[PDB]
Design a protein around this ligand. Structure first.
Ligand SMILES: OC[C@H]1O[C@H](O)[C@H](O)[C@@H](O)[C@@H]1O
Ligand SMILES: OC[C@H]1O[C@H](O)[C@H](O)[C@@H](O)[C@@H]1O
Ligand code: NA
Lengths: 340, 346
């Protein structure tokens, strides 16, 4: 079933319930996932109205871009030319600059295919918006099916050569409560390398580091507490994890990561080369979710995209988007429940 | 009473009914007026769903900007610097460029004051959007009261020196049917001068011309047919009217224009210096409004703003907006019945 209701400020809340009784809900404010629940429990972090997102934290569950992550000095080179993007975190451009796409009301259309339902969100980024050449016509399709698969498919076309590398910013928390650390979750991740950060500004350090046999090796399932209790300088630096991990094998068919808590597990699939993992290292901030004060480590992201830092480490990839080329990306979050 | 429902594509329709039974409705798609009815008759032009606007004509009833009208070659000078804006009509920048504010979903909040209900729409134009320096935090408040006054109040603040001169693109048609020409309407307008256009590209000619005693003189009420039938060069150029009229006396207290049909009149008040009048000179295009094919001259606008062309004719005004300075503008359309005797036949 599908239900649409007012979510505040003119935004809509679109709720999808599949054959299994699982409910997922989105908002056009930022083409974003708001909730995901099973047997009354929330699997992800989210607020109860549009206003909360705007007042508390506008990132959770949102489509972020045009470029996801931090860009050093807000500088990108396009067709050999330097362009300075909006700077919203010191001199860096984080998640596309201030008042970006995650804060706009996108238009949308719902398509019911029975076993699957799709919600197609659309937005036009005008040429020059926040320094980005365009216009960029963007669409994000969130779908949900009877096999409990939540899929995100991105598409874009630009009138001019530009840069494009968005991501989905959902935070998972299988405890179903923000006041509870994810340290008890088990994580598996098919990546042998990571991208260290230079310092507290969080720009990339410049190198690619092998993590095999370190507190960050999750090639083999492991509990989060291990990473959290590690003394690696990179962990210590951010007080948790806040880094890009480089996937060993690319392809949408491979399960790239798996998050588990008891009989409940989330599998991640993507066609992207990296996953940025951030463990809600907010200290005592205590943002409130459903009346519960969030704790440090009270959430974890799986941001699938081209790794941030390619401006300094070209090996990571290239986020350019040439005029007239069609950009496509797909990320899938699959939910499973262990039957005894 | 206030009612709200989905209008399509994620937009909503906000319908207000005042104590007199008059109803007016808006959409957050372009902070736009959708309809205004009296006794079941549409006073303006509008569509039945959001998709129609996007597919047929996105301007009607919308809030347009950041700069309303045509800017020659898209070139503006801001604080001694030349900036080129998005050009969407040949080398011209028309109504803020392509995919502008009239095409966006604005957020909104409704405030019920009892005798007056306000609908405040908000949007942020990011710095650099379509060439405009920013960011620009904008808000448009549309309100309707028990006195049948529909008021539009604009507000804006920029982080950077920029240009700002938006307007509201409503089209009236007191016949209540798009397929009926407004040549049968009576028009009174307190303006002695106008701004002629250079040619078919519609950029300004460079001069201001006195129109007293011409077919464009509406200081004393006359039927619109007088203008439509004129062979004055400017009328022929655009096949009707599509010009800025310079108001003789400024001030929100003065009735600047009055449009009448039989027992119904719409009065126009504004704090702006000119009114751009466009009479839907679409020829045989025939866009469908409520299943009626719109006729040439099937509608008329009263876009109150600073006149377009100030880039070339400095005397028209200055639309610059300094960083941190608060912009404000107010325009009011009021509805009356039996204001005067208007009994004609076409
Ligand atoms: O999740 C939103 C963002 O929050 C923080 O800024 C993290 O440093 C960043 O890596 C993450 O993507
Ligand atoms: O109605 C919106 C606009 O339509 C046409 O482009 C007219 O030339 C212009 O003056 C008018 O304001
Ligand atoms: Na809505």
């Amino acid at each position: 079933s599908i239900k649409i209701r007012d979510f505040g400020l003119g935004s809509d809340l679109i709720s999808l319930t599949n054959k299994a009784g699982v409910t997922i809900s989105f908002t056009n404010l930022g083409a974003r996932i708001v909730d995901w629940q099973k047997d009354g429990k929330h699997l992800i972090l989210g607020f109860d109205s549009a206003k909360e997102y705007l007042e508390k934290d506008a990132y959770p569950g949102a489509t972020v871009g045009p470029t996801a992550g931090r860009i050093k000095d807000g500088l990108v080179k396009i067709s050999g030319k330097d362009y300075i993007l909006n700077q919203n975190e010191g001199p860096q451009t984080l998640h596309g600059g201030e008042e970006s796409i995650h804060t706009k009301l996108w238009t949308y259309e719902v398509t019911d295919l029975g076993a699957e339902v799709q919600v197609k969100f659309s937005l036009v980024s005008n040429d020059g918006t926040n320094g980005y050449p365009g216009k960029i016509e963007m669409s994000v399709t969130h779908s949900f099916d009877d096999d409990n698969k939540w899929k995100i498919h991105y598409e874009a076309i630009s009138d001019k050569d530009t840069v494009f590398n968005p991501t989905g910013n959902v935070y998972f928390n299988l405890n179903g409560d923000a006041s509870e650390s994810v340290e008890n979750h088990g994580l598996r991740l098919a990546a042998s390398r990571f991208v260290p950060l230079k310092d507290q500004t969080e720009i990339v350090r410049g190198d690619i580091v092998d993590i095999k046999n370190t507190d960050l090796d999750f090639r083999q399932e492991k509990q989060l507490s291990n990473a959290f209790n590690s003394n690696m300088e990179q962990v210590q630096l951010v007080k948790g994890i806040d880094h890009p991990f480089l996937l060993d094998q690319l392809g949408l068919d491979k399960e790239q990561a798996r998050l588990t808590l008891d009989d409940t597990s989330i599998s991640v699939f993507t066609d992207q080369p990296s996953i940025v993992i951030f463990t809600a290292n907010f200290g005592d901030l205590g943002t409130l979710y459903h009346e519960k004060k969030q704790v440090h480590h009270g959430g974890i992201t799986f941001e699938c995209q081209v790794s941030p830092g390619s401006e300094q480490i070209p090996e990571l990839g290239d986020i350019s988007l040439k005029a007239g080329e069609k950009y496509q990306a797909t990320t899938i979050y699959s939910l499973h429940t262990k039957l005894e």
